[PDB]
Design a protein around this nucleic acid. Structure first.
Lengths: 129, 149, 66
RNA sequence: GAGACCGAUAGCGCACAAGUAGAGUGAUCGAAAGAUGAAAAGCACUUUGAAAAGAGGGUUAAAUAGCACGUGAAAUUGUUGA
RNA sequence: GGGACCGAGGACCGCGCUCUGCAAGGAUGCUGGCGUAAUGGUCACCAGCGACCCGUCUUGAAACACGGACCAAGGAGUCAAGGUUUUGCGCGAGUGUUUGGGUGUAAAACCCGCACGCGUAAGGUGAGAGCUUCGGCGCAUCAUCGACCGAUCCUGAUGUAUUCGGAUGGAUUUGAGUAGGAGCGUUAAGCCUUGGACCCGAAAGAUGGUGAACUAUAUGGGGGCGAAAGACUAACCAUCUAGUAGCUGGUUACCGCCGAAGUUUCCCUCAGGAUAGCAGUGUCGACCUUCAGUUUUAUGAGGUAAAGCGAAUGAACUUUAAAUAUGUAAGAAGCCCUUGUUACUUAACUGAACGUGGGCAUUCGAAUGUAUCGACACUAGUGGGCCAUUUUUGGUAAGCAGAACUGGCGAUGCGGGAUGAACCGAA
RNA sequence: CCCACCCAUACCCCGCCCUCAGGGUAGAAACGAUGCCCUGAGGAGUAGGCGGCCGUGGAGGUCAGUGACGAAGCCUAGGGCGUGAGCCCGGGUCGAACGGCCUCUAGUGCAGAUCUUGGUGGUAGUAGCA
């Protein structure tokens, strides 16, 4: 795809930023991120706090979980652990729970600033089925 | 055209009238050319034919693009890992059929020839051995290449 | 309905096969007459009239008698 | 009182002496048709013609606006030119 | 040596060479006439060549038939409800203010209570995108083995009201299952159904009215049953009605890109559906990974022709073996060999399956091509044939009829054959 | 049988248009990035699919837009742009409103329908006017 389908101006800014990053870097992470911003909403299913928690249960602590999707709160997870979460947008409850647990919210432009090549990043997508 | 000769033309890259391709002689391809006997004219080229075909109508397939062979440099990037680093090396590898003839011929885009200067023959659609133009003209394809260049 | 659909789909092949079968039957009819005349020319042993049974069982009987 | 409506072949059949003119024994059927000009100032008078009208003259910013009247296409027609 | 057509680009870079420079990654230098209808363009006519009148309909195609006196204006896929797909947007385990209430600069806009609609209340093996401190971690999803639940068939525990229950172990079972939620609202486009349903047009039936027409004499009106007496069952006007068709006719700018089918199978006898195929969209996994109407090698089905019988024997004979098409296979998506388990099996650790180790990562096990291939989901138009070559079955006096392959036509313009669906060249 | 010659949209070289594919373009002396530069290939087309554009009536915003020193409309053996649908200008007429740009909206585009309405032709100064 040469043109994004969405009319979000800030998403256009993001796709331009990650176009530059994918062109001028060797990063398959940047290329995958650009492709995921290009793909449509149904193809970007939500990722929940429960999914990211069970994926960071292993030795993947102290890292940046990155999802090109919307992070949704899960009522079934009683305790939210500390975690470096980057996503397109958060729900109010997920944002509050992460900030109360002690994590930080990052947008994709911030994620580019701190880690342009995606070091110490665990990349997730939601349940497609 | 029947499907078998159609496939043979597709596999020999001859896809337009007057598109010529270098091949090494081997029983499999000899049978293929015998199947496309009623559509082609084939023979044994000499050093002059190979040299002028490479120098005048020589285009290489660089990343799927038809790039004229204007530089020993580009010859070197495309065929350097085979030891072919110049137009003279390419001509040697084609004429004297070497170990990497397959790669050299595949790199060479099919030579797009023109209509012969002087005509084909009064009846060009019968075999060369009955006074036509089709078939295996052994050393006369050099004259045909002269006419077609 | 099933049977009539089958007949509608296979109608013409039936006609062609029938025509070939009738030509074939004509062929063995003429052939049987041929061995009949060959046997009678070679030899034979008849009565005054000829067998009143049908001309089929008659020819099988005579070419079995030899 | 209004309208992201229609604008004289549209919008109610009727923007007009329209349920009128007209047709049918009758029940009923049922049209066409708006626009000079700011103001009639709607062309005095002369001449030709029986008249209708024409040519001069006149009103007007305009008569290339004359109550066959805003603007005035196409089909079709006359004259002249090639 | 002579001729023709062309001059694309616009500082330098590069390959070079014969290196004060140059024919080396695309034309510069010199000169003339004119500087206006001179070049150029538009109308009318002449000349050379070319050139069937458009649309509809049928058919494999023509031919036929239908519509066309001319011009102007009008003129035909729309709206609503309910479904469904995709795209954008908001919020997100929630979502939707607009029934209504409260303000208001008053049909606007802003705010909101209670309900209500829809939805929500655990692994291993091999992979795998991506990170890596290069030790390994490993999303989604997949193949298999798993774990559990709703349901079915059992197996049958303490016990219990003496007649109440399902726990353990199971099953070639089933879910539109759990296996760490995706929905709600709305915008745009598309499809389906119903309404007049893209527009025009069939005979009919019904309700309510207006009128007349009969050598039949104010009146009588049809039929059958019966002995009678008698019981039973046309015309015009408006409206329902914009009634009902599958049938006819018509259905409104341009350009660009991609582009077919005319077919298999199944169900059902219809104004046909479903599956597959051709075309396209989205998603997922790879990298010529891999594939292929093709040759080669090996092996089948044709021993078909031929040579000999100074080899034997006698198309049915053979050492050998034609021409001609044709099926299968050609590697890590591998073969074996070796021993651990198994509920299979065997006289047996014996075989088979499930695994371990090894072996080749470089020519990894022919050629040649490769303008990528595979899987899932969704969507539109298609279901006709005609001619011919070759092979083949049958028949006639000759015709001709039927199968299989391939090729031309459809949707294809151009050169030639004077002309022309089926010819030759070539798209 | 031998030689030369004629030409198709076919084949070869070059120019230009479009499409597709592959590359480049930020500590900005920097860009209708929906842009620009480089390279290669391709170009028939019914049903059908996709995309971009042209035009009409009305609505919101804007051009501190045009206009009786002449809007719109119409006519033109007068010009310019675009492949094209179309767009712009000059001359004549005319008299009172109209247009470009971004969105919205729809009773939005005609050669057919023995189409509807209206106007007008040839037949034709003909048949004919007992």
């Amino acid at each position: 795809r040469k043109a994004p389908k969405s009319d979000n101006v800030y998403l256009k800014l993001l796709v331009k930023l990650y176009r530059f990053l994918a062109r001028r870097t060797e990063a398959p992470f940047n290329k995958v991120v650009l492709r995921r911003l290009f793909m449509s909403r149904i193809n970007r299913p939500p990722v929940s706090l429960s999914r990211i928690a069970r994926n960071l249960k292993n030795g993947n602590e102290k890292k940046t979980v990155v999802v090109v999707a919307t992070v949704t709160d899960d009522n079934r997870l009683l305790q939210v652990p500390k975690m470096e979460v980057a996503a397109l947008r958060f729900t109010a409850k997920a944002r509050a729970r992460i900030e109360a647990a002690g994590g930080r919210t990052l947008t994709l432009d911030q994620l580019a600033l701190e880690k342009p090549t995606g070091a110490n990043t665990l990349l997730l997508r939601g349940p497609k089925n | 055209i029947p499907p078998k000769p159609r496939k043979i033309l597709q596999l020999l890259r001859l896809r337009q009238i007057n598109n010529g391709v270098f091949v090494k002689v081997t029983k499999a391809t000899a049978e293929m050319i015998k199947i496309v006997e009623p559509w082609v004219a084939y023979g044994y080229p000499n050093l002059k034919s190979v040299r002028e075909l490479i120098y005048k109508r020589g285009y290489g397939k660089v990343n799927g693009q038809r790039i004229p062979l204007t530089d020993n440099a580009i010859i070197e990037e495309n065929l350097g890992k085979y030891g072919i680093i110049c137009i003279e090396d390419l001509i040697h590898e084609i004429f004297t059929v070497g170990p990497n003839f397959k790669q050299a011929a595949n790199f060479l885009w099919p030579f797009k020839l023109s209509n012969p200067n002087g005509g084909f023959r009064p009846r060009k659609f019968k075999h060369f051995i009955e006074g036509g133009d089709l078939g295996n003209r052994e050393e006369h394809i050099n004259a045909l290449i002269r006419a077609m260049n | 309905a099933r049977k009539q659909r089958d007949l509608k789909k296979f109608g013409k092949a039936v006609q062609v096969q029938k025509q070939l079968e009738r030509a074939k039957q004509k062929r063995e009819a003429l052939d049987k007459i041929n061995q009949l005349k060959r046997k009678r020319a070679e030899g034979g042993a008849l009565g005054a009239t000829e067998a009143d049974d049908p001309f089929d069982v008659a020819v099988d009987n005579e070419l079995s008698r030899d």
